[PDB]
Structure formats: C-alpha cells, structure tokens
Amino acid sequence: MDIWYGTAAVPKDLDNSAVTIGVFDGVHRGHQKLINATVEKAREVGAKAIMVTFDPHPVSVFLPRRAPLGITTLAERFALAESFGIDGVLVIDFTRELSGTSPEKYVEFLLEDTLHASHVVVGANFTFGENAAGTADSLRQICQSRLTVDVIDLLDDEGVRISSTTVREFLSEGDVARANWALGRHFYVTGPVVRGAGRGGKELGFPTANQYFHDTVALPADGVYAGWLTILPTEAPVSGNMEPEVAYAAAISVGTNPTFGDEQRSVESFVLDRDADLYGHDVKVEFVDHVRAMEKFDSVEQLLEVMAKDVQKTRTLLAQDVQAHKMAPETYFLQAES
Amino acid sequence: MDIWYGTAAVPKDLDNSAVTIGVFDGVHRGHQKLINATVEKAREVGAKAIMVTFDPHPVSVFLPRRAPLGITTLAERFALAESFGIDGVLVIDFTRELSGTSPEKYVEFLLEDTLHASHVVVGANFTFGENAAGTADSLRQICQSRLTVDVIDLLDDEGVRISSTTVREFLSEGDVARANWALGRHFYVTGPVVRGAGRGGKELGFPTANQYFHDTVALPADGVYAGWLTILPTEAPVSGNMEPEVAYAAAISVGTNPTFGDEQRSVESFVLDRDADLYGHDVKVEFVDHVRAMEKFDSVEQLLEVMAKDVQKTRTLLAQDVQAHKMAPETYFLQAES
Amino acid sequence: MDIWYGTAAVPKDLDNSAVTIGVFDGVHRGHQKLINATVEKAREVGAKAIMVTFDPHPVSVFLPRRAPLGITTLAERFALAESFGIDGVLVIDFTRELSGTSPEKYVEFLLEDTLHASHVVVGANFTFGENAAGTADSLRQICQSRLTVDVIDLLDDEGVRISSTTVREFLSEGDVARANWALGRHFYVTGPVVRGAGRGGKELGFPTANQYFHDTVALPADGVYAGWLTILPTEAPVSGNMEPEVAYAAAISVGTNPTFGDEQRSVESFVLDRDADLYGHDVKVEFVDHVRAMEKFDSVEQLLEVMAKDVQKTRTLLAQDVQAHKMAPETYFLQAES
Amino acid sequence: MDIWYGTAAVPKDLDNSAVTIGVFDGVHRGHQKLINATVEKAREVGAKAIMVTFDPHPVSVFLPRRAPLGITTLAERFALAESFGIDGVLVIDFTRELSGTSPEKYVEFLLEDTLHASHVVVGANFTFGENAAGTADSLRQICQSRLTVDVIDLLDDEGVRISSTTVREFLSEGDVARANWALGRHFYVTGPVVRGAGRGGKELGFPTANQYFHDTVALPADGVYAGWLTILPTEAPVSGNMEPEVAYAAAISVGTNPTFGDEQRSVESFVLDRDADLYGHDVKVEFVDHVRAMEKFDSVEQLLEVMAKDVQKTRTLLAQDVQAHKMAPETYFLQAES
Amino acid sequence: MDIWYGTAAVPKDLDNSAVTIGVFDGVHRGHQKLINATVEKAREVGAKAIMVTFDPHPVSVFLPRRAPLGITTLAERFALAESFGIDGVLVIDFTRELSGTSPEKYVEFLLEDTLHASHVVVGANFTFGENAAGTADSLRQICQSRLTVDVIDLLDDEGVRISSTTVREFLSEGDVARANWALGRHFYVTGPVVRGAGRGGKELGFPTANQYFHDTVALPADGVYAGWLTILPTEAPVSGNMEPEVAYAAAISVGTNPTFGDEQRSVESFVLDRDADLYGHDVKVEFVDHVRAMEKFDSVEQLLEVMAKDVQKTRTLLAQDVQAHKMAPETYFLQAES
Amino acid sequence: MDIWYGTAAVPKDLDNSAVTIGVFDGVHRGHQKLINATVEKAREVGAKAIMVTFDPHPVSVFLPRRAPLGITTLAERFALAESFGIDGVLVIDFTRELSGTSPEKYVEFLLEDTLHASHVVVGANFTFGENAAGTADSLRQICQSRLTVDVIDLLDDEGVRISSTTVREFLSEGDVARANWALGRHFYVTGPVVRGAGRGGKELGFPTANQYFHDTVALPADGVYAGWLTILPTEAPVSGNMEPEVAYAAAISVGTNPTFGDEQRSVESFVLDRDADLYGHDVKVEFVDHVRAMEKFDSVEQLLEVMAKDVQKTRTLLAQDVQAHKMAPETYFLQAES
C-alpha cells in the first residue's frame, strides 16, 4: 500500500481511482462499509482503491490540543486500511491545503486533478470545503457527469449509532465490550515494553509488561481488563516462557500518573500462567472485557488476593471470548486452570 | 491624576484633602458612592480628592497566594479612580507600613501628617490598625475635632449586597449580567493579542484575537459569552477590516489550560462579520451575557455549527445591550444579520 | 536500641531473641499488644526483644508510588519501638531479600540463622514468603519444636478494627480524635520550621511556625485543628516567649499547595497567647481535635474574626484534652483566657 | 497599510503593484534600499508598493527552534514597512504555500495571479522555489515581457556587509552602536512594564521600568547600556514625573534569568533624574551605546557606587547622541547635571 | 538464548556450563575474545555457554546517576551476546545479591550452586566480592579442582587499549570510525521514528526519519555523520520508496535539545536519493564516519548548500565503507551519483 | 539571647545598650573584633550587647536573587552571635524600614528611640541612610554628646583582607583551609540526613550520611574534603557505632545535581572506620582541608581505589588538624590506622 503525504506526493501518472474520504479514526464497522464499497468498485473497473484521510485531526487545526482522542494511531489507521484492501492512502494536512477551498475547487483539485477519480464514496455526514459549506448532496451535484458518487448511510445497529464518537464514549466508560462490538475487532494498543516494578518472572505481583502512552491516545477508563497480549514478530531473544506471535491471556491494568501530567497513561499486563519479562519488545494489547475498577491496596496480602481474583475472572471472560472465534485471536494461549 | 507608592512619596506641601480608604477592587457601584462623596466634598472646600488603596491585597500579606481574585488590575483601578474624579491615589503596601500601627497612630500618620485631610469617607465595613482593632466607629471618635467623617452604608439593591465578594461570586458562576449590574458597567479585561490557531481572517473557526491571563485575574467561568471587542487607540497597522476605538460585536470563549497549571486562562474572541487578525495590539474585551457552557467537539462540521449558533445568540443579546445605552459602548459595530 | 538494615547487619553473636514481625506503621494500640507480648517474653527468658519491620513499604515494591501513606516516618517508628521496650529493630528491604523465599526458608534464614529466635509474636493477619503463601497458621506448624509462636488477635474496640488502614481512614476524614483513640496517643508530625508569611510575633495573623511535608506523609484533611506545639530540645536561641520542651496550645491549619503538585502539604501553627518565631527549630505538632474546614477569606477583618473564633474553640477543646491527662502532654502551656 | 496573511487574503481587486520580497528582519539599511526603490516606482506609476515577507522564518520550517533570533518582532517589521511607505504586506507561511512550487510556478502564482505585479525589487542574494532553485538571474529571465525586475546588490559600507546576520553579530557582542549604524536607527524593543524590585520612585537602585522578553527576541549582550525610554501614547495616568511620547535618558541593564522556566531576558531601565514607576504602560527602549559588562555586587554601597558611575557615563554618551542628531529622539529629556 | 533475571530465575535443571562474567557494555572486540573462548569450550564439551552480566551498572549502585553512558542498551547487549553464540544470560542486580558476599561465597553461590560451572572465562581486570576484594588471581586459586579458569589479557591493538571507556571516549569526540574499529562493527542505535520537521518526501531539508534518545544513551558528539539507515523487519506499509531490511545510505545529524525537559538527544536521518517518511517504524542507524561539526544557519539557501555538501561527502565515505566490506551492510542501497 | 524581628519587636523597656551594626555574614574574625568590643563595653557598664543585622541581604532588596551566597544561615548567625556574648539581635528588613530614612533619622529612630544606645561599634566600611549616604565619619559626628562611637578598621592579616567577600572567594575555590583561617573556626553546614545511595553500614562506597542544600547556601567547590561529622544532641536511636556530640573523622564529597529542579548541592559524608546510617538525624559537617577535585568513575574497583586513597589523605590531614588543636573538635574520633 502506498502512503502519500499531501496532494503533491501523489504520482502524476495515476490513471484512475475509486476514492473514499474521511478521518476514519478507529476504522469502525461504519468505516468498513465505505472502504468495502470503494474496494469493490475499484476491482470492478480495474482502478486503485484510495483512502483520503486527515492528519492532524481537522478539529485540532481550529482548536489546538482539544481534538478528540485517537482511537488508533495514524500508523494503525494505515495498517487497518491496508487490511481492508486499500491500495493507497492520501494524508491531507489542513494547515497546508484544502481548508480554504470552495466545494467546487475541492472536487476539481483533489478528486479530479490529483486522484483522477471515476468514483467517490462518502458517509451521509460528509462535509468539505471552506467553512464546511459542502455536504454529501453538494458532492452529488458537483460531480454530475464527471464521476459517480455513493453516499452511504451512517451505521445503526442494536439501537446504537456506530461512529468514532460512540466508540470513544464506550472506551471512556470502560465498556470495551461495546467498543469492540462497534469496531468489529478487539480494541488494542501497541508499543515498546519498558522497565517497571521488579522484573517479570516468578513473582505474580510484578507485571509481565509495562507500557506508557501519550495523552492523545484513547485508552479504556482506569481499571482492570481481561485481554490478550501478543509479542509482535521479532528475532530478538525473549526472557521467559512466552513465544512471539501468540496471543497470551492477560489481566491488564490501565492507570494514570498523578501530579505533573493528569493524563500520562500506563498499561501494566499480568500474563496468566507465564513467567516472562518483555522489556524492549513491541507488544500488542487487545482488550476484551472490564474486570474491575481501580483500587488502593493496604497490604501485599490484599494486593495478591485481588490479583488472584482478577486472574480467575479473566480466565472465565477469555474462555468465552475464544468461542466468539471471529474476534478471538487465531493463535492463543489460555490454560483451563492455574 | 497623581499616583503615589507609599506615604514617603506623597508631596510634603500637600495642603488639604478629602480622603477615601479601601481596597476598591472592581470600583463597583458601592465604591462609586464613596468616591462621589469624596469628590463632592473636595470640590466644596477646594481640596484634592484622594483615594488610599492597597497593593498587594491585604489578605495576601497574611495568606500568600490565597488572596481573592483581582476583579480589575491595579492599573485599571487607577484608570477607574481617575474616571470618577479622584485627583491622587496613595498605594499602601502593608509589608512596608501601617500594619502594626494603633488606630490612633494610623489617623495621626496617614490622614493628618501625610495627607493633611480635612474629611474622610469610608464604608460601614471599614477596619484599620493592628489586628483590625479600628472600626468605622473608632474612626469617628478618634477624628473628633480634627477632621470630619462620613461613614457610608454598604449598598443593597434588588436584594443583593454589592461588594467585591458578590461580584467575584457572579463572575465565578458565569453570571456576567449580574456582575455588570453590580459594577455599573460591562466587566472587562485588557491585554495584548498573541498568536493562536491559524490566522484571523476569512476562516470563521479561527479566532480574531487570542489573549492569555494570569491566575490572579478574575474571569467569568469557562464558556462562551456575548461581548464587545475594542482595539485600544494605536497608530500601528491593523490586519483586516476592524478600526481602532470601535466596539465590535464578538462571541467570546473563555477557557483554561490543563496539565501544568490548572488555572492558566485564555480568552478567544470571534468578531462577528469581520475578517481580521489582531496580533500585537492591546484589546479590551467587555462581557455582556453568557451564551453557553464549554463543550468538546467531535468534528469540524459540529464545531462550525455550534459556532454559527453562538453568533446568532450573540447578535440577539448585543442588539438588546445597545438599548441599555447606558452600559453600551458609544461607538460600536453590530450588523443586523450576517 | 540497635537498628540493623538487612540481615547481614545483625550481629553474628546474637544468642537469643523474642521477635515480632510487621510493617508496624503508626505503632497503634494493636501493634502495642504485639510489642508488649514480645518484650514480656524476652524479659522472662533473658533475651533481646526484636522488631522485624519493612522499608520501603512492601506494597511499594509491587506498586511503586501507590503504597499507603506513612502514618509515621521510619525514624519515628524507631522512636516508638524503643519507647515500648524494643531492644533492636531489623529493617528488611524486600527489593534486597526475603521476597522470593519459601515460608520454610523464611523461618530458617530470618528467625533462626539471623535472629536466633526462641519465640515469635505476630498478628492474626500475618503473611510471609513468596506470593504471600505463609500465614499465621503456616508459621505455627513450621516452628513446631523449633521456637514458640504467639498469634495475637487483631484489636477490635468500640466496634472498630484498629489497623493502620482504619487510622489512615480517620486522618483522611479529619477525625483526629478517632485516629488518636486508635493510636493510643496524639497523632503528631515533626519537622524543621521554615519562613512563611511575615514573621512570628505580635501579629495574630502571622503563623508562629510554618512547616512543609512530602506527599508520602499522612496528615489530617485540610482544615483547622486544636493541638499542641513543642519545640524539641535545643540550645539554639528562640525568638519570642516560647521555651523548648513545653507543649503550647495552638490552632493548626493544614493545607495543600495547588498547581504543580496536587499534594504538597503545609502545616501553619498559630500558638495561643504567644509572640514567637520558630524559624530553624525542629517542632513537634500533636493534633487533638478538628475545629473547622478550610475556607477562603475576602478581607483581613473576616480572616482575623475567624482566627479569633478558632482560638476560642481551640482553648475549649484543649482544656478538655488536659483532663484526659493520659494523652495530654506532661508539661504544657494553656491560658484560661486571652 | 494593509496586512494579508497568505495569498488568499490578497484582494482579487488588486490591479497593479511594485513588489519587493524578503525576510526583511530588522529592516536594516540594505532592506531600506529595496523598499525605497519599490515605493519610488509605485509613486512613479499608479501602483501599490507591496512587501512580500515570511513568517515563520524560512529556516525554522526546515529546522524548528534553530532559526535566527528576531532582530524585530513581526509587528515591528510591519510598523517599519509602513514607515518607509509600503502600502501592503503579504505574509507567506512556507508550511502553507510557495514551498514545493518550482521557480516558474512561483512567479506565476505569487507575482502575476496574486499581486499582478508590473515591477519586482529583490536583493542579489534572493532565492525561491523548491530546494532553493530559483535565483536573482532566474527572476530577470522568468519575468521577460511581464514584469520589469530591479536586482540590487547587497549593501557594503565602511568595509562591512550590512545584513541581518551582521546586525545579530553586533547585538550579540554588545556593540549596539555598530548595530544602530547598520540599521539606520537606534535598535529598540517595546513591551509592557511589569512589577519588579520594589517600586520606581525616589530610590536610585530600583528600576523605573521592568520588562521581560522571550528567548526568540534578539537583545544586546547582558550588560549596562545608555539609551532612551519612551512611554508610548496613552491616556492612562503615570506614576511620577514622566510624560508620554518624550524620550527620557536612561541607563539600561540587560540581564538573563539564570534558570527560570528557561528563556526570559530582562530589561531594567533606570531613568536619569526622574522619580517614576511605569507599571502597566507600554514603553519603548532604544539602545545607544554600551556602558559596561555585568558584575556581581557584595554590598549596597558598591552597587550604588557603580550605579552612579553608570549614570555619569550615560549622560556623556547621550549628550553625544543628541549632538549626532540624525539618530537621536525628536523630543527628549536629558539633564547635563545630576 | 535464555535470559534470567537473578540467580533464582536460573533453572535448577542446569547440569553444566562454561561461564564468562562482566559488564560487557558495547560487547567490543575485547569482550568478543572472552565470549569466543567460552562458546568454543562449551561447544568442545556438552555445555551451555553462559554470560553473567550486570544491570544496573555496578557504578550506579554506588553513585546513582553517575554511571558511564550505555554504549548499547541492555536489550542490544542481549542481541549481541546471542549473535556470538551465548546460550544464556544471567543478569545480576547488585542491589539484590552478590554485593556483600565475600569472594569465597561468590564462587560457591554463583558459579557452583547456581550455574554448575566447569569452566570460567574472565578479563585480567575482573573484580568481585565485597569492597572489590576478589581479583583475577583470587579466582584461579578459589576454583582449584572445581572449575578450570581462563584469564584473558585486556585487548591492545594498534597501541590502543580496547575497553568500554576507550569506546565512550571515541564516541564523545565524534570519532565513530575509531569506535567502530574497537567495537568490530558499526556503532548503532535503534528506535521508533516519530513526527518531526514537516514530512519526509521530496523536500531535501526535511529528515526521512526523526528519533530521540534518553540521556543515558551514548551517542556520537553533536554533528553530521555518514551512515546507513535500515528499516527493521516489518509487514507495516512504508511511505515512500524504501523497503525493510536494506541498509540505505544516509547523512545523519546528531543534536541535543538546548533545554527541553533535560536529556533528549536527537538523531535526524536524511536518506540519500530516496523520498520517504518512516514515521512509526523501528529503524537502525549505523554510524560510519564524521562529516562535520554542528553549525547555525541564517538562510535556507545556506542550509541547503551545506546539506548538499553533506550528501557529497557521505557518498564518498560510504563508497569506501562498502570497499572495506568487512563492516559494511550485506544488503545496501547507495547511488554513486545524485 | 533575644531575637527581635523589626524595631517594633524591641522591648520599650530597654534602658541601655552597646550596639554593633552589620550584615555579619559568616561572623568572621573581623566581625568578632566588632562583637568583642561591644560585649566588653556592655560588660564594663550595665548594658545589653546588641547586634543589629539584616535579612534579607540588603543587596537582594535592590537586586532580587543576585545577592551574595550565605556563608551561614540566619539561624547560624544567631547561634554565632550568642556564642560571642551578644545579648540581643535586632533583625532589620529594609523592605519594611530604615531604607528611605536619612542618616540623621536613622540614628534617632534606630539607636536612640529603639535601642537607647550609649555606645556604637561599626566597621570602617559601614554605610547607612538613603542611597548609602551615611558613612563611618558621619556616625561619629551625628552621635555627638549622645553615644560614644568606636569605629574599627577592617581586618588585614597575612596580607589578606578578611571580609565576607574574601571568605566566599576561598570557599568557591575549594580553599576551605584559608576560609577557616579567616573565619576563626572550621567552616560548617548543618542539616537533616536523608535517604541516599543504599544504606550506611559495612559497605565503604555508600555514604554514612546524605544531605542536600538549597542554592543560596555557600559551599566549597565540588570535590572531596577532609572533615568532621557530628551528630547533634538527640535522644533518638542511632543506627551503627556512632554516638551523638562526638566529632567523627570523615571524607566529605560535595557535589551538584547536574539538573534536578535547579539548585541543590549535595554533601555525602563517609565516616572513617565506622559502620552507621544517620537517616533522620541532624548532623554538623565541618570542613578542614581539600583532598581532590571531582572525577568520573568507569568501574567499581576504580571508585573504591580512589575512595581508599581519599581515606588515607583524610587521616593525615585530620591528624594535623588535631595537632593544630585551636580549631579541632574538643571531643573526637580518629583512628590512626584502618
């Protein structure tokens, strides 16, 4: 998959495309409808399926540091796009271009001159051009006799509107199960494992993995979750009895760091039935279900007691998740008991 | 108007004065009664009308960093004093003098030796001398046969006590309309315009002006307000179609800056029907009425939609404010519609 | 009293001991039962009474910066231990030793090889060994025919379980009277006096003493308390009319410092009927009873008025405290009136 | 003078213009040669004289936070342009436009489509287009039969190249006299006066005005300088015996905060023979000549002794500056004697 | 390769081993002599080749935050050990164990009880036990009829001692060529690529990759270097015309943030003749030779001019590195011409 | 000794006094000449010997945060005054009083009305009144037939002027021996011992005591010094084989935190031939002579080697200090041999 930053980076010899346009944060089930529609048409006419997306978030251009939290990183947005059949992603920066353009010139410059599009696919909530003047209906009329337009209804399922907003709401509530249902996959984050408390191994109270994330990253509410930890493909040696590319059952503790930065987030993972230290590796953490709210501990005895209960409930939640094989990992480790 | 810092700075040849004493923060309608009384008497006897005020705030001397928020800056207190006819302001620093003085010596040193006062005007809540021992009644008896004393009742109107405390309460609640009613004018702040999001001009979502204020400055609660923006007199060039010394209709967004300083306040002004960038100018922002609480935005479409509604409600509120010509600006710009 | 950091520091020629083991934070009335039991047995057999305690807090080893607040400093834990008849304290660091040891090896290495113990005393909630596997019952069976074991019930009195947890709860609520009841003494902190507002002396609104404490120190909730201030023994000169080693009646204001560190705690003490400045001295502050919640002040008049009411209520609370001579200070200063 | 941010802000109404292009930082005597030629030609014909300038600095777009120090602020660059008869300034942001553009498209888009230029004036060092490809020669040949081009050699005078670089070098060395010679005026900074050491008045060692500047502001090397302080036009009252719009002789101390939130240069002004406090006013500080390097003081007698020597040297230096009228203030206060 | 944190993590199953002990920072050519001897002997017999190493650095246990800079990370030390045929690494924390131990108990506990060693290989400078008491000679005599001991002299080559100290000196001076000679490979760092100046692509002065390193990481002196950049194995899409696992010729700028939260060195890589943006990828940067010291730029034409000179020098230097095959990349991209 | 903050704290009861005036920072041998003369005269008559001193430093009132480093704290200045027989110290704050006062009003207000002085003793360099107008000669003539005045020349000894400046120079250079010669005692600092590297005990490279000082404290140049450490009188238990009120031979390492919240010098003390941990105690550290400059260590064997050399040099230096009794400790611990 090609990745182009700005209209100038797009190849001049691009001959034909089917294009979908949006922020696409989270690549949720509604987004997948737009992408599938685009990929299907591109196949039919022998063109490239192209995603036009935005970075920074369009809201951040107007309200710096008050944009919505990133459901995924830009890098994972690219990976997800590719996984659903996108051939090229054009990343637009509204501080550089296409902000003060009329709807008419937006279609002329982006869809025609740049992308040579014969088809465009957008959601019913699509807007474009200076001061948001263009709507999905504007697009239909401007494109008359120039390219075909598919405006897809926003996705409603089980009485819920599936949008980036609703996914962020679910994550903020700690309802990862609903977030996952809307995403069509387990919500996950990926990052390097750093040093934390002790070293991972025989001690149940030392995390197997410690990770930290910036304040722009959407994470579930502080608390403990059932999930799966995967060491991403690597030839680097691994301390302990975990193999790369296997999803290991884990109790995952999400927290925040007080006094200096009221939003520096940590993810501490306690891998079930394993003795390992993952310092230095890139690790994916998929969230499955909420186990409990955060609590303060008065003794090691109490801490370890609650730890063991988290493991018990995690084991039950994950055993059930496997049966929803569709979101479950292909290769996984989960013992029937300790 | 003369401004003296400390008793030592007062001219030795001062021959006669009528004096009022207090913090005078906000120069509200109650304060204006005291000042008017003082100016009237000074006129009658051919003396100077003098305000004795305090900086730092007397409370801050005892409780550093826990003094009440400044309704106005000291500089604006001076400007307001002058506007109501005060001929001289004596600024007293309680860390330097008059803190450990008996009520008797306070009158002897300040009113007589320093100010050569023939008349003094204070509120019913006036206190002075070491450990607040002197009251308004103490002042009356100490001044017997030495100078005349006018003790003015605290102002009650529409079931509300007008005090600096009540004004701060109204501002904290976002009730700028009540604050204004108590002040006898539009509550305002003034400051240099700095760079913010984008550049002011054609884009509706970029503020016309961005300003920042320190944590000691009383501002209305976070939210959006209807108000008037005035570029203070200047010969410096102005970017766009705003002229200096005209009050322009504006939607004003007051906010705070998270993580590092839970009280760094911003004021972002969106001037109605104008395309301008006010970087580098000193701008006055007068608040008229509350429009809405702060909210987070999920898209540019939503942001601009709410922006347009703020403009609509601001236009209605300001059209009404003009009819209260008494607080309304003398020279103003407000279009009937977009 | 000997203080040993780590098993290696214990003398090899130690011949016999009676040992009690625990965090002992606060040395509350339940802790005193264990210590008294240990000291009594050591006397009976002519052995040393030894306390095995832990620093850092065992919880902090697993959850750095999320351990419970220190009811006392380690230094005061030592002083309290000594006051109840302990002959030696062994301080164990779980990052160095005894964390990954089996219950069996824990008894062999610590109690036998290191301490040559003939008797051990623990609470019913005692746990030890890797992953908290050892309990009080484990200890009884492991020690069969090797040393005698006394497991003491946790202390319940007036429907309250006396534990470090319950004491911290009372302090957090500002219920110093209940905290004191559980501790068997006045809760106190000690530290050097630094510069604050003004200088202590004739001015009622300037504290006699200003102290600051780190975020790991348990202090009562923000507010005003009745208490006793003692200048610890010193030959350094004292500014004003306070003598060392006398408990002076005081109104004590506990506060926190906003914006940078949402937990930097201050203790400002206003000593009744005294004019003094305690800069540079080490001062003990004992808390007796809650007087009022924190409030913001709008004027010096109001501040001093509330100050005087605090003094009045403090005088009444302390006059009553003296009658509970058992917790009251041996040498004290408290005037019948101002 | 009009100020336009970006090409889209420029009136489509624009019929004809004489244009000059450059960073123009400092608007030094070399820059004035370019501006003079443009204004003359514009006056010759019926054309607007337009300056195209750049913000942020083009170097900072490549190397963020490694751009040269600003000899003046952008606001002062506008002020200076207007003073030399420029009718409009177009401010280009290279992160928005004219960056990836080739030399050929640059001339078409900027000079023809946007500015409708009949004449261009650029320096011999002028560069444009992608990867700095376009040059002075490339401009004469691109504009063939479209715009008359005037390329002006870089100014050499007294064996010294007058450039922004050269001016920054002089300032960095503390050689303000040479900087002024190159600039064609006294180097100056402007800004609000804040609270500092004590209050301005009768005491000599307390500044008349205290100002602080961010670290992007070019200032002379730390030290003491002879200069002029002017209170900018205002109707606000002035504490002391100074009036607005008069240049007062001052000894100016430039310093740096050893380590206070990084950044932050200080300018402290001691106005000769005046007793005033300029808190809250905007003041202009013009630098005439270096007096001495920074030094540390061990006593008050020593500090004041050197202070007195600073005033004596300043009187002499400022007398010569008035004698060398060309650069001196048109309306000034300078006593020959103390 | 196995990685064990502490002696208790080592399998009790371990029957036989050839062991080498040291900090092994950098795993330079002297270290490789020790490792080679251990691996050969292990291969000779039926034994595991084990490295005992130390984290944190033994100096930091005595002098926190005053330890030498890490030539490599601990993760890379593991990677290097594995590449030289080490079968297990035992990581010792001297704050946990083997610190107070005498030389005699060290050999019994570490080499016999834990590792069951038949052979030991140590440097002539090797020290162990309490207060650095044990030495190379003490090891040969302690292991009598237990373990065969091979003491290897410190490596001297070309009149230079090859040590971690010597390597750090070379790096600090910017002499990466000498560092590489001592290391037996190109010195490198690895890390995720982040957002930096603009986006990587057609523009030459914007880096292909931006990386930041903490202040514990040894890096070459600030300046420009010729090197190779490799995208580490990944299935993630790449923006631009670069492929993973190929070493691309690059000009590498090493810098320091003047004062940004302390710490933080930057490595900015400009890949020759490629237009790419490596945001989100893990990349390895190998340093071959010094090109120039840091310099400040006053114009874009000047910056790009020097940039072009940097590329020319880099081409020449990297051509020679490929000619000196031994150290060059096995699969690389380098154009002879621009 | 009495301590009075400000003239208003001085008893109105005061009938007669011999007074000396000065900053008295360090209370060096020149200061002792002034104090001795005052105490003798007070003893001669029936008068109190009074020191008038200044806090904050008079330089800091003019130049905040640019005052000289404190040779001692104000608390230690009180301690030293008392030790030389001063009966009262009056502390003057020049931001409160005696600043704007003329020389004539200074003598009337301070020496007559407040202190009722029959005798004054000042240095030849003495200055007072507004703008440093009053001098030594002006004092003899102002006090005519009121107070007998004794002006004492500044102390020159061994060709060196003994002044606070001279003492600070010696300290800054690391020449503590010369500083001690000028002071008439060992230069010292006092403060609480905190947690540092490991715990004090059997290990040689871990300090017996760790202390930190703010940046206003004069300390010797970074490096290693021979000195004496004394635990100040206490009934608190001591960990290890040290007793209070005995001066123990120590090697003292003075350092600076490279960049940790700014400020913060460290003093780490290694007590010879003792195994102790002084956490929580107040300790006095006396400096006798410089041993070596700071150096970085690359190994533990190297660190301990230099540590051992430091102890050897310290033994020799402290043996000579005991031989030069005059300055040595009256009760000390120093072994001739390790």
In summary, what is this structure?
Six copies of one chain form a homohexamer. The first copy, chain A, is an alpha/beta fold.
What distinguishing features does this structure have?
homohexamer, Elongation Factor Tu (Ef-tu), domain 3, alpha/beta, 6-stranded parallel β-sheet, 2 domains, nucleotide-binding (chains A, B, C, D, E, F), 338 residues, 8 helices, Rossmann fold
Describe this entry's structure for a reader.
The PDB classes it as transferase. The entry lists the keywords riboflavin kinase, nucleotide-binding, transferase, ATP-binding, multifunctional enzyme, nucleotidyltransferase. Six copies of one chain form a homohexamer. Chain A is built from eight helices and 19 strands. The first copy, chain A, has 338 residues and is of the alpha/beta class. The first copy, chain A, folds into two domains: 186 residues, Rossmann fold, CATH 3.40.50; 147 residues, Elongation Factor Tu (Ef-tu), domain 3, CATH 2.40.30.30. In chain A, the strands form five sheets. In chain A, strands 11, 12, 13, 15, 16, 18 and 19 form a seven-stranded mixed sheet that branches. In chain A, strand 15 and strand 16 form a beta hairpin. In chain A, helix 6 runs antiparallel to helix 7. Chain A is elongated. The two termini of chain A are 43 Å apart. Chains in contact: A-B, A-C, A-D, A-E, B-C, B-D, B-F, C-E, C-F, D-E, D-F, E-F. At the A-E interface, strand 1, helix 3 and strand 14 of A face strand 1, helix 3 and strand 14 of E.
